[PDB]
């Protein structure tokens, strides 16, 4: 009963449906990269057979989905990293982003038994992956002439600042996208969680929900998944392993970073940065013990967190702890720790047990 | 082109255990391999180190994973056991257990085990995390000496809170409490982890417990490195470039457009992000090696990708090797630049990274 991630399948199902309601003329790429944002790659795909496609960061992730029996299209959002992977991508029926000359040249040169669906990736201001506007027309035209590309060619981009509604970058990216796509056949996709929730004019043909599919807000404005009618999917849980007396004036943890002002009782939780809980968490960060809120005291260690229960607290070794979950949104922990909700949910280690419910 | 990969140098690990033996040549070694061996691989790290006298783990589950992989060496449960029903298993697996609370002691008192168990009584000397407080320790100790389920002698363990701070008199106060309690008791004594081993030779006693320094990473926050102490870095975190792209002066990069280029340049995109374990806290200017040479992170680290500034006519290509930390770039340098503990950097990696073992 130590560090466990409990994944609520009913919440997942709900969220995909709730997102369809917000984007009712758009198909869904369920984004499941990085072990489905910490929720389990294969189990998340298995929970969502109504998704129109799954979205992954890397070919290895797509192959893992196929290995576990997943048959729906998988979009390689970064494309492919070696020309020698094209026969697999063709045979496996993965759709691929194409963002550079190397990938384009490989598609021109290869002999494949079946052509492949492509999403040409346009750099519209993020400046990470993608073909730049001034190179994009010639690039696109070569893609349309490739016998190894199943026509028409689709067009994809991604917003850098969709979470800042009051700033002009999204509208700039959008106008670049729209200028490029004019008169072209091919499906259009630019919106992920932020686009879906705040930019209805960015929905087009396909949207790609990631963090909000897991019932977690993409914004850092205090909002939670529930503010958009999405239900939190993950709870990170554990157990007390000690309840101990502690006297006034006595420090706790490494570096003696917290000192009690009174006599009290401390709880020790079987959870640490070796499980994925941020070492950054300050004293005062909320944890739930038997469902009431108590503060972290002293530094988070690799395997343990101390909490302040109070001097006659009746909590005991064995009792349930919620790091985030029912009553304690991950976005609250994000705000209190200054750690992005994205990183909190995703950057867990393999030590955490995975449990699925409903 | 290789994706997010941890490369674990077995030769370095073996070197480190022997180095640590040279620094504390009268003490036995508990190799501390909790949290997937500080990111290096629980079972493979233990397989690399047959010379260790024991292996230390945080939780029973980790000890059972060692036995399941065929490690037969003594394993110490540093936090003891969380359920009384664990005792038969602990007994029959020959796991050594810390004991630090009443629940554990009463469980030992009313079990009837096939074989008695080796116990290390955990004393709170001032960390105030686990252990028995001094005013309860004599009575608690006596009860262990009278328990038929405990092999005699009862051994004695504690742990330093601030051993990385020599100008602090905290460590000395811990040692005075520890020595007072151990006076005239027959068991083995163990207080020192990496910081105690390196800086406090009067803390070595019968058994020392290297964690971080075993992996060639310094336990201190003063920009010292494992090599400061003659230890060799074990882990390299590596990847490859997936794109090299033109970029213009006045142009932003990444989410929030937090870095803006002052020149026309080329950027590199690495197959590495916080989805692999690389910290999202890394600021612009954090170093990475591309083809052996240092280049800076530009813009925020993403879940799967990191952007670096290569230069206006750089010849780096998609596919080229990238070192996040490793040869020519110690994890402690990343720790300094990101303001993250080196403990966290090496340990808080996800299952996405491949594990490769060399030498
Ligand atoms: C990660 C990602 C998404 C999903 O992002 P969220 O903000 O988590 O919804 C969509 N598109 C691309 C290209 C991505 O890399
Ligand atoms: C974590 C731990 C160690 C190892 O600590 P380092 O600072 O990594 O050497 C040793 N003993 C105990 C009880 C521990 O919890």
Residue numbers in the entry:
A (entry chain B): 2 to 359
B (entry chain A): 1 to 359
Copy out sentences from the published article reporting this entry, exactly as the authors wrote them.
E. coli CBL is a homotetramer that catalyzes the formation of l-homocysteine from l-cystathionine.
Tyr-274′ is found in the innermost part of the substrate entranceway, and it is conserved between bacterial alanine racemases. Given the location of Tyr-274′ at the entrance to the active site, it seemed likely that mutation to a smaller Phe residue was useful for allowing the new (and larger) substrate, cystathionine, to bind productively. To confirm this hypothesis, we used x-ray crystallography to solve the structures of the His6-tagged ALR(Y274F) variant and an inhibitor-bound form. As expected, the Y274F mutation had no significant effect on the overall architecture of ALR. In the wild type ALR structure, the hydroxyl group of Tyr-274′ forms a hydrogen bond (2.6 Å) with a crystallographic sulfate, and it has been proposed that this sulfate mimics the position of l-Ala on its route into the active site. Although we also observed crystallographic sulfates in the structure of ALR(Y274F), there was neither a sulfate nor a water molecule in the position equivalent to that observed in the wild type structure. One implication is that removing the ability to form the hydrogen bond (by mutating Tyr-274 to Phe) has perturbed l-Ala binding; the increased Km for l-Ala in ALR(Y274F) supports this hypothesis. Removing the side chain hydroxyl of Tyr-274′ opens a pathway toward Arg-280′, without otherwise disturbing the structure of the active site. The conservative Y274F mutation enlarged the active site pocket just enough that cystathionine could enter it and form an external aldimine with PLP. In vitro alanine racemization assays showed that ALR(Y274F) had a 1.4-fold decrease in kcat and a 1.7-fold increase in Km, compared with ALR.
